[PDB]
Amino acid sequence: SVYITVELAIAVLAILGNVLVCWAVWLNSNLQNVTNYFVVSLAAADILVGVLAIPFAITISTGFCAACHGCLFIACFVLVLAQSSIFSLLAIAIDRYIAIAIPLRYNGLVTGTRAAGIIAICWVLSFAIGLTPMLGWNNCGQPGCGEGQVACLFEDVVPMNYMVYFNFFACVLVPLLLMLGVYLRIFAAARRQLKQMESQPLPGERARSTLQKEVHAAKSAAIIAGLFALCWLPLHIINCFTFFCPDCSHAPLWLMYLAIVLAHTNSVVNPFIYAYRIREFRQTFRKIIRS
Numbered sequence: 572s573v574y575i576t577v578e579l580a581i582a583v584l585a586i587l588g589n590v591l592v593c594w595a596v597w598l599n600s601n602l603q604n605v606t607n608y609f610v611v612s613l614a615a616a617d618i619l620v621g622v623l624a625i626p627f628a629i630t631i632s633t634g635f636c637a638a639c640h641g642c643l644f645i646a647c648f649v650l651v652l653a654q655s656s657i658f659s660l661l662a663i664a665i666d667r668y669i670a671i672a673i674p675l676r677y678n679g680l681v682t683g684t685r686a687a688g689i690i691a692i693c694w695v696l697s698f699a700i701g702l703t704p705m706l707g708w709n710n711c712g713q714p715g716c717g718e719g720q721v722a723c724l725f726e727d728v729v730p731m732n733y734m735v736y737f738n739f740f741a742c743v744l745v746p747l748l749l750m751l752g753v754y755l756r757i758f759a760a761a762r763r764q765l766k767q768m769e770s771q772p773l774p775g776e777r778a779r780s781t782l783q784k785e786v787h788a789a790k791s792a793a794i795i796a797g798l799f800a801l802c803w804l805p806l807h808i809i810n811c812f813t814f815f816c817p818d819c820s821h822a823p824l825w826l827m828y829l830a831i832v833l834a835h836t837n838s839v840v841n842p843f844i845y846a847y848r849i850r851e852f853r854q855t856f857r858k859i860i861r862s
């Protein structure tokens with residue numbers, strides 16, 4: 572009952588943390604910029620982890636009996652929250668690039684309305700993708716609980732060809748390659764901005780101070796995304812060994828949960844990465860707690 576205890580411990584922090592983030596954004600209007608509309612989507616997504624994903628994960632770990640639909644939802648619900656984070660992390664990356672690349676058109680393109688629009692779409696695409704195994708791409712009853720009910724075991728009810736090709740490579744690796752590729756242009760151009768401002772016949776510390784603050788936000792966003800791949804790669808790497816190499820000793824359970832717990836930890840680091848990186852956030856929280 573140790574794994575259970577740890578998972579429960581995470582669920583609490585995941586809720587408290589991201590809920591605090593959502594609250595701080597609703598109180599302080601200085602945090603209600605278009606950029607943080609996506610951060611909220613990240614919060615809500617990372618809240619449902621400690622609310623549903625973790626509860627489901629602890630349940631499916633021991634395995635139960637239920638229909639194919641009910642078994643798939645509980646098993647593929649984490650694929651939804653993890654996919655929604657992909658879009659959110661990608662949007663934030665693009666956003667932080669649009670500001671530095673084109674500061675003028677930034678306010679013209681990046682609107683508070685389009686933000687809510689994109690978010691909605693991302694969630695819809697997240698359910699479509701995350702619950703693709705429910706569309707028929709599953710191993711329900713492939714060569715106990717009785718007719719109708721199926722032994723709900725993640726590896727037995729969820730195809731591996733999906734988890735690898737469709738899910739990992741296409742819906743995770745590719746995005747993380749686009750994101751990384753984005754940050755490549757961001758900092759490459761950001762340093763060019765400083766060079767052009769290094770050969771300017773005027774001080775203009777307003778542009779420098781703003782640029783450095785736009786870069787500080789872009790860097791903070793890079794750290795958030797970096798921790799995502801850092802907490803999910805190990806879990807996918809494990810599945811790449813099992814699939815591509817049937818000979819390769821199937822990953823043990825004590826090592827399996829560690830990669831699963833590692834993924835559940837990602838939802839927790841955000842609230843703390845905001846309080847640390849953003850001086851505006853930490854002070855907002857500090858007020859809420861006291862009062």
Ligand SMILES: Nc1nnc(-c2ccc(O)c(Cl)c2)c(-c2ccccc2)n1
Pocket residue numbers: 624625628649650725726806807810830831832834835
């Ligand atoms: N073999 C295997 N086993 N369990 C999970 C699993 C299940 C529920 C969860 O809540 C978490 Cl975090 C992980 C994954 C897995 C791997 C990559 C992406 C998503 C799931 N792969």
